[PDB]
């Protein structure tokens, strides 16, 4: 993969959030982190600094209650692809709205928030 | 639909074909090739209609391509007759059975590039695409179609070949069985035209019982399980304990004289062949895929059947999406549509340079 977002992923400690937008991985404005559209799917990468100098990786794909099948399917594939690109070093986690893990919920210091709506599906019906 | 990726899901009984980005296959037809008994051939519905003057052949047996000459006809018909595309204009994604032999994957790559001249192609495992379509990267897929049933456990996007289970009992075998028991009840279903009627009855009235024994007894009491079915000729028949006896075969293959374990056992068994540390994830992500998983009640019986087999503290979940007859195709349509998938394709350039062996390094 030569996708520009792939080139930016896991380069340094922190939190990176992308939203699935019509079959593409689109970065979320850092000011909007924690505000999740329940009609959309997202890919979150958490990069932690290890004392061995190396970087630890946790990939979470978050699925809103109303997200379309192409968005949930793409978030899952993008996750696999981001993991492989990171030499399989990432641990993958499926996050469903209302059933998020304590770890993922912990990434958001002012608490994660749900908001109705989202970007339209990428499918042709 | 101009310079758009195509997705072709080739099954033992049906070919599912269309365009990447569509939410469903544009063409669904029988994977059959008809030749004059004694154009030079027909494919699909055309072949079935003229069945009376043709010799019918199925190029895919138990999910595996077995007749290369007949498969090229299928693909030609798919491109030209059903999709109405110039193959040389569209990157093409094909699907394959888990444990698909090395030489078969090469053959498929060669024919696409050498006979059809595609600008690019890719082969993906059917069960993995179903998992992707359900929005998961980890889970165990139960894929059951017309010719084969498999249990495919997948972790973080990749099948675990060592733990896959294959069972040569599926849709066609169920159709044949319902035929036998239905004539046993007093009716008469022997003819190919009649096999077709039975298949429709199999798909419309059959279901899986939550408790097979109680079901049998409840069918011997009142007639609350009985259902009516209108024949093409207008005659009405009454179907009884066969509604649930036919798919029972999936759980008790002994019914058809098969020695194998049922699909609940092969599921439990595949899971137990996996690393202990992932079993919980498998158990909580049981995805049903394919036509033979469409019986009403199938998800509840499996839910019941596997909680009985697994440790009492295992969170168990069966996922049986309404569109699961097309899950594989849909998974392909999403995969081939992704912005990040464009460098994944095998190019004609790469094929000319490396040959058919390229498939083993590009698709895994
Ligand atoms: N509603 C239904 N109930 C039961 N069986 C069904 C239903 N709909 C379709 N089927 C059966 O599913 C089969 C076709 O399913 P599918 O397209 O998944 O198989 P395939 O890809 O051709 O085969 P395979 O995976 O074995 O190679 C046929 O046996 C058909 O009768
Ligand atoms: Ca959306
Ligand atoms: Ca990994
Ligand atoms: Ca199939």
Numbering used by the authors:
A (entry chain S): 3 to 127
B (entry chain A): 3 to 40, 50 to 375
Show sentences the authors wrote.
To establish the structural basis for the observed behavior of Mical-oxidized actin, we determined the atomic structures of Mical-oxidized actin in non-filamentous and filamentous forms by X-ray crystallography and cryo electron microscopy (cryoEM), respectively. To this end, we obtained a 2.7 Å resolution crystal structure of Mical-oxidized actin complexed with gelsolin segment-1 (GS1)18. The electron density of the DNAse I binding loop (D-loop)—where Mical’s target M44 and M47 residues reside—is weak, which is indicative of multiple conformations of this loop. In Mox-G-actin structure we observed a slight (~ 1 Å) narrowing of the nucleotide binding cleft (between subdomains 2 and 4) compared to that in the crystal structure of unmodified G-actin-GS1. Narrowing of nucleotide binding cleft could potentially affect nucleotide exchange rate in Mox-actin and affect its recycling in vivo. To test this directly we measured the rates of ɛ-ATP exchange in Mical-oxidized and unmodified G-actin. We found no statistically significant differences in the nucleotide exchange rates between Mical-oxidized and unoxidized actin in the absence and in the presence of profilin.
F-actin disassembly can be broadly defined as loss of polymer mass due to depolymerization (monomers’ dissociation from filament ends), which is often facilitated by severing (filaments’ fragmentation resulting in increased number of depolymerizing ends). Most recently, rapid depolymerization of actin filaments upon Mical/NADPH treatment was observed in in vitro assays. However, the molecular basis of such dynamic behavior of Mical-oxidized (Mox) actin and the mechanisms underlying its disassembly are hitherto unknown. Thus, Mical-induced oxidation of actin—including augmentation of cofilin severing—provides a robust mechanism to disassemble different actin forms (ATP/ADP-Pi- and ADP-bound) in response to cellular signaling.
